[PDB]
Amino acid sequence: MYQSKMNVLNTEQYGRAMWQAYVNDGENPNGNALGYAYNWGYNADGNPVLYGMTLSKYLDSKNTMPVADTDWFDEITRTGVIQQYNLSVSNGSEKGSSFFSLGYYKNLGVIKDTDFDRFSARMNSDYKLIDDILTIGQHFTLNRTSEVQAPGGIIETALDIPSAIPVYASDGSWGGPVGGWPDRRNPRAVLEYNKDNRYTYWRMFGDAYVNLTPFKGFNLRSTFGLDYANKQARYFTYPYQEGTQTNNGKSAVEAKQEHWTKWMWNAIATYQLEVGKHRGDVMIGMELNREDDSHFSGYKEDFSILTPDYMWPDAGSGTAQAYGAGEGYSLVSFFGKMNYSYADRYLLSLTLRRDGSSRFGKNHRYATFPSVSLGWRITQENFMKELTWLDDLKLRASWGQTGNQEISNLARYTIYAPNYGTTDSFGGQSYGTAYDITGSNGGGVLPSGFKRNQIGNDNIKWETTTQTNVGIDFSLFKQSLYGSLEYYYKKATDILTEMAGVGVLGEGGSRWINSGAMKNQGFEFNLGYRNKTAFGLTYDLNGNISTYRNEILELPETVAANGKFGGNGVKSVVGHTYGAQVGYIADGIFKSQDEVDNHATQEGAAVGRIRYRDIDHNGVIDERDQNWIYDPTPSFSYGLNIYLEYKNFDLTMFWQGVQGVDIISDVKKKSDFWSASNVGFLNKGTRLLNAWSPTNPNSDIPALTRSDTNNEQRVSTYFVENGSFLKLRNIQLGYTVPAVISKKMRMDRLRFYCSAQNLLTIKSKNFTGEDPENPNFSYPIPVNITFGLNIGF
Amino acid sequence: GKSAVEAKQEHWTKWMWNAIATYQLEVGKHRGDVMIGMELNREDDSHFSGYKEDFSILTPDYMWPDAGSGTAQAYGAGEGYSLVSFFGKMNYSYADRYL
Amino acid sequence: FSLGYYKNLGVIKDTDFDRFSARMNSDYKLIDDILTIGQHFTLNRTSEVQ
Amino acid sequence: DIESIQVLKDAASASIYGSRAANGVIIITTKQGKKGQIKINFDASVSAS
Amino acid sequence: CDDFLDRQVPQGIVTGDQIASPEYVDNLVISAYAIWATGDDINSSFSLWNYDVRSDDCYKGGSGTEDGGVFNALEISKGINTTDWNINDIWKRLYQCITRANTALQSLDQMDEKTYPLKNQRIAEMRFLRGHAHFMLKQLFKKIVIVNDENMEPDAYNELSNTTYTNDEQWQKIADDFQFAYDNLPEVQIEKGRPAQAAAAAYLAKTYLYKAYRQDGADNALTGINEEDLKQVVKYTDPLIMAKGGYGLETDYSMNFLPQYENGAESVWAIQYSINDGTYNGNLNWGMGLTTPQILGCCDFHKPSQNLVNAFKTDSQGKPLFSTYDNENYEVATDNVDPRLFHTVGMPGFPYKYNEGYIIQKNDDWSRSKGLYGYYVSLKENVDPDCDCLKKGSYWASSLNHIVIRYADVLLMRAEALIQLNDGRITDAISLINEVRSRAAGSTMLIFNYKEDYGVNFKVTPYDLKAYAQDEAMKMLKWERRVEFGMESSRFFDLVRWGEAKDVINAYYVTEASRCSIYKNAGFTENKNEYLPVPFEQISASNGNYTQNFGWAAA
């Protein structure tokens, strides 16, 4: 079930807000070229007051679109249904083991015409031959998933389309805007037109291995992994026509195919030895990886019958396009690892890799990454054994590095592409190389060429992330109080950055550079208490908490000005958190002509408008008056699992909180203003019914205006809110039938249970939307309520 | 001076289901085996394709259908089949002589 | 549990064939032979230049 | 992975398997695990045409 | 370890070292043309119409003042921020066109002429394109960066400045580009999209005409008019040079804006939009995709002003009502009128693009503004709704060529420089105005029966050839440029050349408030609003190497 649903004006409410917006600006509210007419006048003090309100019956003069009070979110949501079934079976003999499972999932999301499902089989087995010294094994899973996904932007469209627009037009077609009504598409119709854009996805995952133990402590092993998926889909383009929202009469189909084929191969050599007090592992080995991808698709326009049965490429009578390309990479890897344990109380560990990637030139192919960790089982040292209340306590510290090469397969190269221009754009800017050099106006193939996509860099190398870590494990009161702490410092250097080009460089001037650095340090804490009680109740709490800070250390000059990782391209994010943002400081509202004239010069400032702070004190409110106003890093997050067992019943709660987080709300643009949007007459949030006026002087909401004279759309503290939350992620209640009862139906375990996920949300009073975890337009987070069972033989 | 690349793809799919139920008896010097059961089938074939023309560099890795300039086409079809049946069998020996 | 590989290079130049394979078979009989589940699975990959 | 290859050349013995057994059916079966054995083979060949 | 990480390589592209091969040199040339068709969008057409809404010719149109709010800010001269997305956008796009020119020039420079005999005509073509963009950037921003080192490395672009050069020698660096093109282009281009030598002369002249009204001070006011520059406009509009290329005025005005008459004698150089041409929906003029009237559902931008309407009014002898034209609306029954009004402005009661089956009305069906932006439609760039040339992609767009230099421009530009050089050749500038004015008076094919069907009184006459004063002569050329180039997005550009923007537009703001409510709070600030601010992000990335225009605060 859809839960946190956004409150959005209704047809009557829409007309009240509009009258306010008009009269605030001092224009005749009867001049709205929609269907509203207003009986209004002035109060004793001279401020405008609304008396009555009449709406016409149709939105057009020719009466093809009736007037509604449509709740568009209720109209695009539904009660979802989930199903889940899984069977698994296992066998274990002296000479081997064997496992087999079958599974199914099916989930009809709360947004209509979106769903997902999965079929799964897995078989694993292993065999011990000779003297259990030759061993063969296999793990393999096979899966078929299929999905129809929510279109891009339906939540914003549902927020945007006014109640007055009906779901169905008089003729029974889909409803749409006409007359003066805004440029917004019918969101029910979008979802329905997209219901057959289903992909089918087959993934096969598994490995096979051989293991040899030629004598005591010596092992050899070789594993070949296979990871292969393929995805097919027809995407259909049906013709639409919702009022003035038209598509001409375009019909098309695109049959798309993709393949991802990855495989892995390694060989491993390990020695073990136990010398009275010394313990020790050594392991050296080698690994190969390779991915090869391909994708292609055929596109055809114009169909006589508009159903997925007809809409195959062979049956189109219009223009065709063909798409596709491949790519891939490979990795080689040489590694060793060394473990040592003295007297089971001092532990040392050593890792060393040399790692090559096809994504670099040979002059930089490999890089070498060592690692070191130490252990100190304090309690086994004899002077700690005067402490009956502390079972084990172990201090550990580690330093080590890891390469990163997760970059474009083409990162090294200067890329020219033919890009004739066969591909959907938006508003032009296809950047194609075809051109009617002849002046014929077309009708036939044009001459074309090549355009630069990327400048190469001969000396890209491995990026290095380096971590230092320290923590301590503990166990008190004979294993009932347990947990661990963690402190780490984590720095990425020579960071591999897709770096934009300087403006004058022009088309495709970007290049991947090792240029940039970024830290993450923080604390991590686990703590669990568990004990029985002397009336029948077992209780087991185990919670956790953590916090971190992130700081960008250096950055290419053109990425600092870019804003790609931070301050909106007005200030450089070097020295701030990844994703921090700069903006104007909103300092309330001008409430009196007095307060505009005494403020800095502010273009568009009047009574009822946002007062922006004069940060440089220059007596002018201009682009220079912005500062660091947004950081996405919580002060801390935390989780907690309560578990109870009483009298064959069991109860679980899992709580999760994030505390101290800034969110940026873009719904607030739609909820607090009549004109903080590109387009006039959109549906608005229900909060602006409380907008400041002479009438209503106790408010934070700017006075309703029809033009963003004050540019209150500018990034500002007005949109940052406290996105802190605590959520009951899950609660589950269970009964398990006593053994003596189920064991006679030959059942080691029979249990039924009942649960609800995401049932409850605690948030800040200063947050003004619904889900602080999903404050804008992403697929809503539903409340699930579940029943289920467990049977085992 | 003609360059082109066609990128075919075909798919097949079958699945059956059957539920036999056999019986076996041995009395005197006679044995018999009677069995009955149904059966199902479904075939769902497919294919489609693509086409491009007039490429610039001539290697098997540059000649993907996005690096072209010329005209393009597309193909495709789809087939089907179904079946449902019922069967039966019997056996007899009566002396270990007359089958 | 089987495996396999078979690579053939034809007598006429620049034609070949190669096949990878796998196979898993099993069955499990549970309660005095009144319940028996089993399976048979195969997975190939051929790659022929014609 | 071949255990036995029956070839049902007849029609009164291949009539059970379907209408689509007019041209005769070739019944193939695959291997299985024997009782109390753990055997493992390894074949190879390198040829020339 | 090594062969493994080299096997997979880029698919479906040309790499930077390959791109310079001769086999690709002509691909780069074409691609540098292509971006003039494929590089603008509905808010950035290389027509620059979205920005001539500042002019007294037209209003931005649309749903309302928020429908492209940054262009309303531009239209009323208030609440322009240097951070505005359009200003950054147009700056960025125009320099993108420059890229394709320079990339082609970079590889053309290395070509051997003995084995590629068109080497210098191709090179000329590209430098023409490069001048085209630098010219328009210069019009938009005054203080621009000169990007004309096709061998410049990517990194060296960071140390460029919009003040390497003084204002004049910024204009000259543009003139140099079009001059080389004149020296090297062929007289006739059998492939009509390629500029001919006369086009290079035309643009060369236009560059010196804009260069001659000098602003060599710190602000934007006129610091005197240079006649070394003017005598060039004369040299490069010489009729003898234009006749070597076969250019001239179409025998009826409407031909410049009609699909059947593309690439006529007046089209000196045009952007060759096309249809049925292999692209997704066509190489249509998407940049005018907003300006189709409501008859096609959307979007009613670029609507002409009543000011421009009333400007086609004429006195009893067929001359402009210089002083009185805006004091009463154009009334069809009783006013004499210029035939060019019915080729520029589709008006209620009259046919849309010469089609009696589409009569415009003050309706839901034609205008989108409930009257805010009026009820007039821009005729020049729209086309007959029945035309083969008209398709809907994401917007409605045609294949009608956009003409950058009409040969009327050349005659009127020649007229200008002659009038500015008071040197006895004024009766020759009047000779040129009469060329355009008389052609226009007879451009009544396709509207020949408007007297009987609607009542219009066409009445336009040439000026008597007398010994005119320089000041009266300027007024007469100015008026001819008003009626000749209406809605073609160089009216506001003309005013800043003349240093008359504040006086004429601030005045327009008070006269036109009566008819378009938006101008209520409009106010043009001289020595500020004559050019868009250089974009804030651009300056801010420059590390103080860029300098903002006069009148704008230290941000």
Residue numbers in the entry:
A (entry chain D): 224 to 1016
B (entry chain B): 472 to 570
C (entry chain B): 323 to 372
D (entry chain B): 175 to 223
E (entry chain C): 1 to 555
Paper excerpt:
For the levan utilisation system, the cell surface components are Bt1760 (a GH32 endo-levanase), Bt1761 (a surface glycan-binding protein; SGBP), Bt1762 (SusD) and Bt1763 (SusC)15,19,24. Recently, we showed that SusCD complexes mediate substrate uptake via a “pedal bin” mechanism. The SusC transporter forms the barrel of the bin, while SusD sits on top of the barrel, opening and closing like a lid to facilitate substrate binding.
To visualise potential different conformational states, we used single-particle cryo-EM on detergent-solubilised apo-Bt1762-63. Strikingly, several distinct conformations of the SusC2D2 complex are present in a single dataset, and after further classification steps, three dominant states were identified. Following three-dimensional (3D) reconstruction, electron density maps were obtained at resolutions allowing rigid body placement and refinement of individual protomers. This yielded structures corresponding to the three possible combinations of open and closed dimeric transporters: OO (3.9 Å), OC (4.7 Å) and CC (4.2 Å). With the exception of a few Bt1763 loops (L6 and L7) and the Bt1762 segment following the lipid anchor that serves as a pivot around which Bt1762 moves upon lid opening, the conformational changes between the three states correspond to rigid body movements of Bt1762. Mutational studies in vivo provide insights into the key structural features of the SusCD apparatus and cryo-electron microscopy (EM) of the intact SusC2D2 complex reveals several distinct states of the transporter, that is, open-open (OO), open-closed (OC) and closed-closed (CC).
